[PDB]
Amino acid sequence: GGLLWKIPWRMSKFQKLRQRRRLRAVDNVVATIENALAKKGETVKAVERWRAEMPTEAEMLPKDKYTIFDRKEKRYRKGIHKLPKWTRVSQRVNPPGY
């Protein structure tokens, strides 16, 4: 193509820091909701599903925090900043093996 979308293949240490904090912030929203309901003895299927198949920022590997799965790439990995609205959508899990 001749139209230039200058998007670097890797992120800067500043974009990574904000990513860690956005993943950390989401964990606090879920924990705040889960703790508020536990005090009343209630549960929500969405929360129970999140805490079951989604890790916390402290439990994620750097590769899972800054990259995503892409079957079209050489090594099946791709910069997470290449996902649409990547700063406002949740993305923490990739297929096993990649």
Binding site: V26, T32, I33, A46, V47
Partner: peptide, 21 residues
């Protein structure tokens, strides 16, 4: 109020809001 009908409403926009008890 702290209720399931509102908690599930927040799990859909957790990437946009800040919650506090």
């Amino acid at each position: 109020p702290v209720e399931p009908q509102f908690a599930g409403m927040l799990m859909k926009v957790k990437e946009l809001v800040r919650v506090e008890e």
